[PDB]
Subunit: 78 residues, 5 copies
Protein backbone atom coordinates (compact mmCIF):
# COMPACT_ATOMS: atom_id res chain seq x y z
CA UNK A 1 0.00 0.00 0.00
CA UNK A 2 1.09 3.62 -0.38
CA UNK A 3 0.77 6.84 1.62
CA UNK A 4 -0.43 9.64 -0.59
CA UNK A 5 -2.01 13.07 -0.52
CA UNK A 6 -5.15 13.91 -2.45
CA UNK A 7 -4.16 16.55 -5.02
CA UNK A 8 -7.22 16.92 -7.29
CA UNK A 9 -10.52 15.72 -8.71
CA UNK A 10 -10.88 13.91 -12.03
CA UNK A 11 -14.21 13.82 -13.88
CA UNK A 12 -14.78 11.30 -16.64
CA UNK A 13 -18.23 11.78 -18.15
CA UNK A 14 -17.67 9.68 -21.30
CA UNK A 15 -16.70 6.42 -19.52
CA UNK A 16 -17.11 2.67 -19.89
CA UNK A 17 -19.96 0.91 -18.18
CA UNK A 18 -19.53 -0.75 -14.84
CA UNK A 19 -17.93 1.87 -12.63
CA UNK A 20 -19.61 2.03 -9.17
CA UNK A 21 -20.63 5.08 -7.22
CA UNK A 22 -17.61 7.07 -6.02
CA UNK A 23 -15.01 9.60 -7.14
CA UNK A 24 -11.79 9.62 -9.14
CA UNK A 25 -9.14 11.46 -7.19
CA UNK A 26 -5.63 12.45 -8.19
CA UNK A 27 -3.14 11.53 -5.48
CA UNK A 28 0.55 12.16 -5.05
CA UNK A 29 2.56 9.40 -3.41
CA UNK A 30 4.57 10.52 -0.41
CA UNK A 31 8.33 10.86 -0.89
CA UNK A 32 8.39 10.00 -4.60
CA UNK A 33 5.92 12.57 -5.78
CA UNK A 34 4.54 10.00 -8.25
CA UNK A 35 1.00 10.62 -9.30
CA UNK A 36 -1.88 8.32 -9.99
CA UNK A 37 -5.63 8.41 -10.07
CA UNK A 38 -7.33 6.42 -7.27
CA UNK A 39 -10.96 5.55 -6.76
CA UNK A 40 -12.60 6.88 -3.60
CA UNK A 41 -15.69 5.85 -1.70
CA UNK A 42 -14.93 7.44 1.70
CA UNK A 43 -15.53 11.01 0.54
CA UNK A 44 -11.86 12.10 0.71
CA UNK A 45 -11.07 15.73 -0.01
CA UNK A 46 -8.16 17.57 -1.61
CA UNK A 47 -5.24 17.88 0.80
CA UNK A 48 -6.20 14.76 2.76
CA UNK A 49 -3.57 12.12 3.53
CA UNK A 50 -4.76 8.69 2.43
CA UNK A 51 -3.72 5.06 2.20
CA UNK A 52 -3.96 3.40 -1.23
CA UNK A 53 -4.18 -0.22 -2.33
CA UNK A 54 -3.40 -1.22 -5.93
CA UNK A 55 -4.16 -3.99 -8.39
CA UNK A 56 -6.95 -6.49 -8.40
CA UNK A 57 -7.74 -6.11 -4.66
CA UNK A 58 -9.03 -2.61 -5.44
CA UNK A 59 -11.65 -4.18 -7.77
CA UNK A 60 -12.49 -7.26 -5.74
CA UNK A 61 -13.51 -5.15 -2.72
CA UNK A 62 -16.72 -4.12 -4.50
CA UNK A 63 -20.00 -5.98 -4.53
CA UNK A 64 -21.66 -6.59 -7.87
CA UNK A 65 -19.63 -6.99 -11.04
CA UNK A 66 -15.95 -6.28 -10.22
CA UNK A 67 -15.17 -2.81 -11.73
CA UNK A 68 -12.21 -1.86 -13.90
CA UNK A 69 -10.49 -0.12 -11.01
CA UNK A 70 -6.83 -0.79 -9.99
CA UNK A 71 -6.32 1.80 -7.20
CA UNK A 72 -8.57 2.35 -4.19
CA UNK A 73 -8.28 4.66 -1.22
CA UNK A 74 -8.73 2.28 1.70
CA UNK A 75 -8.50 4.74 4.54
CA UNK A 76 -7.67 8.21 5.73
CA UNK A 77 -4.38 8.72 7.58
CA UNK A 78 -4.36 10.40 10.97
CA UNK B 1 -5.25 4.34 -12.69
CA UNK B 2 -3.22 6.69 -14.86
CA UNK B 3 -3.92 9.74 -17.00
CA UNK B 4 -2.47 9.31 -20.48
CA UNK B 5 -2.63 10.81 -23.93
CA UNK B 6 -3.40 8.73 -27.02
CA UNK B 7 -0.53 9.10 -29.48
CA UNK B 8 -1.39 6.57 -32.16
CA UNK B 9 -2.78 3.25 -33.28
CA UNK B 10 -0.93 0.00 -33.19
CA UNK B 11 -1.44 -2.17 -36.18
CA UNK B 12 -0.98 -5.84 -35.56
CA UNK B 13 -0.12 -8.26 -38.34
CA UNK B 14 -1.41 -11.30 -36.42
CA UNK B 15 -2.80 -12.00 -32.95
CA UNK B 16 -3.44 -14.95 -30.65
CA UNK B 17 -7.07 -15.91 -30.35
CA UNK B 18 -9.41 -14.35 -27.83
CA UNK B 19 -8.83 -10.61 -28.30
CA UNK B 20 -12.17 -8.78 -28.28
CA UNK B 21 -13.46 -6.13 -30.67
CA UNK B 22 -11.61 -2.87 -30.02
CA UNK B 23 -8.31 -1.17 -30.76
CA UNK B 24 -4.71 -1.26 -29.55
CA UNK B 25 -3.67 2.35 -28.90
CA UNK B 26 -0.27 3.71 -28.08
CA UNK B 27 -0.56 6.13 -25.12
CA UNK B 28 1.90 8.33 -23.27
CA UNK B 29 1.53 8.57 -19.51
CA UNK B 30 1.11 12.14 -18.28
CA UNK B 31 4.11 13.38 -16.32
CA UNK B 32 6.36 10.37 -16.76
CA UNK B 33 6.28 10.35 -20.55
CA UNK B 34 6.31 6.55 -20.39
CA UNK B 35 4.66 4.78 -23.26
CA UNK B 36 2.48 1.70 -23.31
CA UNK B 37 -0.20 0.04 -25.40
CA UNK B 38 -3.72 0.14 -24.03
CA UNK B 39 -6.86 -1.57 -25.27
CA UNK B 40 -9.73 0.71 -26.26
CA UNK B 41 -13.42 0.00 -26.70
CA UNK B 42 -14.60 3.66 -26.57
CA UNK B 43 -13.40 4.90 -29.94
CA UNK B 44 -10.77 7.12 -28.33
CA UNK B 45 -8.87 9.47 -30.63
CA UNK B 46 -5.26 10.56 -31.14
CA UNK B 47 -4.47 13.46 -28.85
CA UNK B 48 -7.26 12.55 -26.46
CA UNK B 49 -6.64 12.53 -22.74
CA UNK B 50 -7.78 9.26 -21.22
CA UNK B 51 -7.88 7.29 -17.96
CA UNK B 52 -6.28 3.80 -17.98
CA UNK B 53 -6.64 0.81 -15.65
CA UNK B 54 -3.93 -1.87 -15.60
CA UNK B 55 -3.52 -5.50 -14.67
CA UNK B 56 -6.11 -8.23 -14.43
CA UNK B 57 -8.94 -5.73 -13.86
CA UNK B 58 -8.52 -4.68 -17.53
CA UNK B 59 -9.26 -8.23 -18.67
CA UNK B 60 -12.01 -8.94 -16.16
CA UNK B 61 -14.16 -6.08 -17.55
CA UNK B 62 -14.90 -8.22 -20.58
CA UNK B 63 -17.66 -10.76 -20.77
CA UNK B 64 -16.70 -14.23 -21.95
CA UNK B 65 -13.29 -15.88 -21.87
CA UNK B 66 -10.81 -13.58 -20.11
CA UNK B 67 -8.86 -11.77 -22.80
CA UNK B 68 -5.09 -11.41 -22.60
CA UNK B 69 -5.29 -7.65 -21.98
CA UNK B 70 -3.46 -5.86 -19.13
CA UNK B 71 -4.35 -2.17 -19.90
CA UNK B 72 -7.76 -0.69 -20.71
CA UNK B 73 -8.93 2.83 -21.37
CA UNK B 74 -11.87 3.34 -19.04
CA UNK B 75 -12.88 6.91 -19.96
CA UNK B 76 -11.83 10.31 -21.26
CA UNK B 77 -10.81 13.11 -18.92
CA UNK B 78 -13.18 16.05 -18.67
CA UNK B 79 -11.78 19.54 -18.98
CA UNK B 80 -12.92 20.49 -15.50
CA UNK B 81 -10.54 17.94 -13.97
CA UNK B 82 -7.91 19.54 -11.82
CA UNK B 83 -4.47 18.89 -10.32
CA UNK B 84 -2.16 20.55 -7.83
CA UNK B 85 1.16 19.74 -6.19
CA UNK B 86 0.81 18.23 -2.69
CA UNK C 1 9.27 -11.03 -2.47
CA UNK C 2 11.54 -8.35 -1.06
CA UNK C 3 13.78 -7.89 1.93
CA UNK C 4 12.72 -4.79 3.84
CA UNK C 5 13.21 -3.06 7.16
CA UNK C 6 10.33 -1.83 9.34
CA UNK C 7 10.72 1.95 9.66
CA UNK C 8 7.43 3.20 11.09
CA UNK C 9 3.68 2.81 11.03
CA UNK C 10 0.45 4.34 9.84
CA UNK C 11 -2.64 5.11 11.87
CA UNK C 12 -5.91 5.09 9.93
CA UNK C 13 -9.12 5.66 11.87
CA UNK C 14 -11.48 6.09 8.98
CA UNK C 15 -11.22 2.99 6.83
CA UNK C 16 -13.31 1.04 4.34
CA UNK C 17 -14.82 -2.22 5.67
CA UNK C 18 -12.77 -5.41 5.42
CA UNK C 19 -9.32 -4.61 6.82
CA UNK C 20 -8.22 -7.62 8.96
CA UNK C 21 -6.84 -7.50 12.51
CA UNK C 22 -3.21 -6.35 12.34
CA UNK C 23 -1.11 -3.23 11.72
CA UNK C 24 -0.15 -1.02 8.81
CA UNK C 25 3.64 -0.78 8.98
CA UNK C 26 5.98 1.39 6.94
CA UNK C 27 8.88 -0.59 5.48
CA UNK C 28 11.93 0.34 3.43
CA UNK C 29 13.12 -2.06 0.72
CA UNK C 30 16.72 -3.06 1.30
CA UNK C 31 19.25 -1.66 -1.13
CA UNK C 32 16.74 0.56 -2.95
CA UNK C 33 15.48 2.71 -0.09
CA UNK C 34 11.99 2.68 -1.66
CA UNK C 35 9.17 2.76 0.94
CA UNK C 36 5.73 1.29 1.19
CA UNK C 37 3.11 0.28 3.68
CA UNK C 38 2.81 -3.46 4.38
CA UNK C 39 0.24 -5.25 6.53
CA UNK C 40 1.60 -7.11 9.59
CA UNK C 41 0.06 -9.95 11.56
CA UNK C 42 3.21 -11.42 13.19
CA UNK C 43 4.22 -8.59 15.49
CA UNK C 44 7.18 -7.14 13.57
CA UNK C 45 8.88 -4.37 15.51
CA UNK C 46 10.41 -1.14 14.22
CA UNK C 47 13.93 -1.81 12.87
CA UNK C 48 13.25 -5.49 12.20
CA UNK C 49 14.26 -7.09 8.93
CA UNK C 50 11.27 -8.70 7.22
CA UNK C 51 10.16 -10.45 4.03
CA UNK C 52 7.32 -8.85 2.03
CA UNK C 53 4.92 -10.27 -0.56
CA UNK C 54 2.98 -7.91 -2.86
CA UNK C 55 -0.13 -7.84 -4.97
CA UNK C 56 -3.21 -9.94 -4.66
CA UNK C 57 -1.45 -12.83 -2.84
CA UNK C 58 -1.28 -10.49 0.19
CA UNK C 59 -5.08 -10.42 0.19
CA UNK C 60 -5.86 -13.99 -0.82
CA UNK C 61 -3.75 -15.27 2.09
CA UNK C 62 -6.63 -14.22 4.41
CA UNK C 63 -9.27 -16.76 3.62
CA UNK C 64 -12.81 -15.63 3.02
CA UNK C 65 -13.80 -12.21 1.67
CA UNK C 66 -10.75 -10.58 0.11
CA UNK C 67 -9.35 -7.69 2.13
CA UNK C 68 -8.21 -4.66 0.18
CA UNK C 69 -4.56 -5.29 1.04
CA UNK C 70 -1.68 -5.53 -1.47
CA UNK C 71 1.41 -5.96 0.71
CA UNK C 72 1.95 -8.42 3.57
CA UNK C 73 4.93 -9.14 5.85
CA UNK C 74 5.25 -12.92 5.58
CA UNK C 75 8.21 -13.49 7.88
CA UNK C 76 11.11 -12.20 9.88
CA UNK C 77 14.51 -12.60 8.33
CA UNK C 78 17.17 -14.34 10.37
CA UNK D 1 0.82 -4.05 -22.97
CA UNK D 2 4.28 -3.42 -24.39
CA UNK D 3 5.99 -3.33 -27.75
CA UNK D 4 9.12 -5.48 -27.84
CA UNK D 5 11.50 -7.26 -30.17
CA UNK D 6 12.31 -10.94 -29.89
CA UNK D 7 16.05 -11.25 -29.26
CA UNK D 8 16.47 -14.97 -28.65
CA UNK D 9 15.29 -18.37 -27.48
CA UNK D 10 15.52 -19.56 -23.92
CA UNK D 11 15.88 -23.24 -23.18
CA UNK D 12 14.74 -24.64 -19.86
CA UNK D 13 14.98 -28.35 -19.46
CA UNK D 14 14.32 -28.61 -15.74
CA UNK D 15 10.87 -27.12 -15.12
CA UNK D 16 8.03 -27.28 -12.64
CA UNK D 17 4.86 -29.03 -13.84
CA UNK D 18 2.25 -27.03 -15.75
CA UNK D 19 4.11 -25.08 -18.44
CA UNK D 20 2.02 -25.28 -21.64
CA UNK D 21 3.19 -26.26 -25.07
CA UNK D 22 5.11 -23.34 -26.53
CA UNK D 23 8.39 -21.47 -26.24
CA UNK D 24 10.23 -19.14 -23.89
CA UNK D 25 11.51 -16.12 -25.82
CA UNK D 26 13.78 -13.36 -24.67
CA UNK D 27 12.49 -9.95 -25.74
CA UNK D 28 13.65 -6.39 -25.49
CA UNK D 29 11.06 -3.71 -24.73
CA UNK D 30 11.09 -0.88 -27.24
CA UNK D 31 12.44 2.48 -26.07
CA UNK D 32 13.51 1.29 -22.62
CA UNK D 33 15.65 -1.59 -23.80
CA UNK D 34 14.43 -3.60 -20.82
CA UNK D 35 14.57 -7.32 -21.28
CA UNK D 36 12.26 -10.03 -20.11
CA UNK D 37 11.24 -13.57 -21.04
CA UNK D 38 7.78 -14.01 -22.57
CA UNK D 39 5.87 -17.14 -23.41
CA UNK D 40 5.05 -17.67 -27.10
CA UNK D 41 2.48 -19.83 -28.83
CA UNK D 42 2.41 -18.17 -32.27
CA UNK D 43 5.87 -19.27 -33.40
CA UNK D 44 7.51 -15.85 -33.19
CA UNK D 45 11.03 -15.58 -34.56
CA UNK D 46 14.16 -13.70 -33.58
CA UNK D 47 13.97 -10.06 -34.69
CA UNK D 48 10.21 -10.04 -34.81
CA UNK D 49 8.36 -7.09 -33.33
CA UNK D 50 5.72 -8.31 -30.90
CA UNK D 51 3.05 -7.18 -28.41
CA UNK D 52 3.27 -8.49 -24.83
CA UNK D 53 0.71 -8.78 -22.01
CA UNK D 54 1.95 -9.18 -18.42
CA UNK D 55 0.70 -10.52 -15.15
CA UNK D 56 -1.97 -13.10 -14.45
CA UNK D 57 -3.78 -12.41 -17.75
CA UNK D 58 -0.89 -14.22 -19.46
CA UNK D 59 -1.75 -17.30 -17.44
CA UNK D 60 -5.53 -17.09 -17.47
CA UNK D 61 -5.50 -17.07 -21.31
CA UNK D 62 -4.81 -20.82 -21.17
CA UNK D 63 -7.76 -23.08 -20.55
CA UNK D 64 -7.65 -25.24 -17.43
CA UNK D 65 -5.21 -25.11 -14.53
CA UNK D 66 -3.30 -21.81 -14.40
CA UNK D 67 0.18 -22.11 -15.77
CA UNK D 68 2.92 -20.29 -13.86
CA UNK D 69 3.45 -17.74 -16.65
CA UNK D 70 3.32 -13.94 -16.29
CA UNK D 71 4.21 -12.71 -19.80
CA UNK D 72 2.66 -13.76 -23.11
CA UNK D 73 3.25 -12.62 -26.69
CA UNK D 74 -0.26 -11.79 -27.87
CA UNK D 75 0.56 -10.65 -31.40
CA UNK D 76 2.98 -9.47 -34.01
CA UNK D 77 3.22 -5.77 -34.91
CA UNK E 1 9.31 -13.76 -16.59
CA UNK E 2 12.85 -12.91 -15.57
CA UNK E 3 16.25 -14.45 -16.14
CA UNK E 4 18.10 -14.42 -12.80
CA UNK E 5 21.04 -15.99 -10.97
CA UNK E 6 20.66 -17.51 -7.51
CA UNK E 7 22.92 -15.52 -5.18
CA UNK E 8 22.04 -16.95 -1.78
CA UNK E 9 19.63 -18.45 0.74
CA UNK E 10 17.22 -16.55 2.95
CA UNK E 11 16.15 -17.99 6.30
CA UNK E 12 13.08 -16.95 8.37
CA UNK E 13 13.06 -16.97 12.22
CA UNK E 14 9.29 -16.56 12.33
CA UNK E 15 6.83 -16.87 9.43
CA UNK E 16 3.12 -16.72 8.80
CA UNK E 17 1.16 -19.90 8.23
CA UNK E 18 0.50 -21.42 4.85
CA UNK E 19 3.92 -21.34 3.22
CA UNK E 20 4.56 -24.63 1.39
CA UNK E 21 7.70 -26.78 1.53
CA UNK E 22 10.54 -25.13 -0.39
CA UNK E 23 13.21 -22.48 0.02
CA UNK E 24 13.48 -18.71 -0.15
CA UNK E 25 16.36 -17.83 -2.50
CA UNK E 26 17.87 -14.43 -3.18
CA UNK E 27 18.32 -13.96 -6.94
CA UNK E 28 19.90 -11.28 -9.08
CA UNK E 29 17.95 -10.24 -12.21
CA UNK E 30 20.33 -10.42 -15.14
CA UNK E 31 19.57 -7.32 -17.17
CA UNK E 32 19.38 -4.93 -14.22
CA UNK E 33 21.39 -6.45 -11.35
CA UNK E 34 18.30 -5.95 -9.17
CA UNK E 35 17.80 -8.48 -6.37
CA UNK E 36 14.63 -10.09 -5.12
CA UNK E 37 13.60 -13.16 -3.14
CA UNK E 38 11.95 -16.00 -5.02
CA UNK E 39 10.39 -19.21 -3.77
CA UNK E 40 12.04 -22.46 -4.92
CA UNK E 41 10.71 -26.02 -5.08
CA UNK E 42 13.14 -27.41 -7.64
CA UNK E 43 16.20 -27.45 -5.38
CA UNK E 44 18.11 -24.66 -7.13
CA UNK E 45 21.63 -23.89 -5.98
CA UNK E 46 23.69 -20.74 -5.61
CA UNK E 47 25.08 -19.65 -8.95
CA UNK E 48 22.35 -21.38 -10.92
CA UNK E 49 20.60 -19.51 -13.76
CA UNK E 50 16.86 -19.64 -13.28
CA UNK E 51 13.60 -18.42 -14.75
CA UNK E 52 11.18 -16.54 -12.45
CA UNK E 53 7.47 -15.84 -12.62
CA UNK E 54 5.98 -13.06 -10.51
CA UNK E 55 2.60 -12.12 -9.08
CA UNK E 56 -0.46 -14.21 -8.39
CA UNK E 57 0.57 -17.02 -10.74
CA UNK E 58 3.40 -17.83 -8.32
CA UNK E 59 0.79 -18.59 -5.64
CA UNK E 60 -1.92 -20.15 -7.76
CA UNK E 61 0.56 -22.86 -8.93
CA UNK E 62 0.32 -24.45 -5.50
CA UNK E 63 -2.31 -26.82 -4.23
CA UNK E 64 -4.11 -26.08 -0.99
CA UNK E 65 -4.56 -22.73 0.71
CA UNK E 66 -3.15 -19.88 -1.41
CA UNK E 67 0.39 -19.27 -0.28
CA UNK E 68 1.60 -15.74 0.30
CA UNK E 69 4.19 -16.02 -2.47
CA UNK E 70 4.65 -13.55 -5.37
CA UNK E 71 7.77 -14.93 -7.05
CA UNK E 72 8.49 -18.56 -8.02
CA UNK E 73 11.42 -20.19 -9.81
CA UNK E 74 9.66 -22.10 -12.58
CA UNK E 75 12.73 -23.63 -14.21
CA UNK E 76 16.46 -23.76 -14.62
CA UNK E 77 17.93 -22.09 -17.72
CA UNK E 78 20.14 -24.10 -20.10
Amino acid sequence: MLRATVTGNVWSTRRIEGIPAGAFLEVEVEGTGSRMIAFDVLGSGVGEHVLIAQGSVASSWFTGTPPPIDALIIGSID
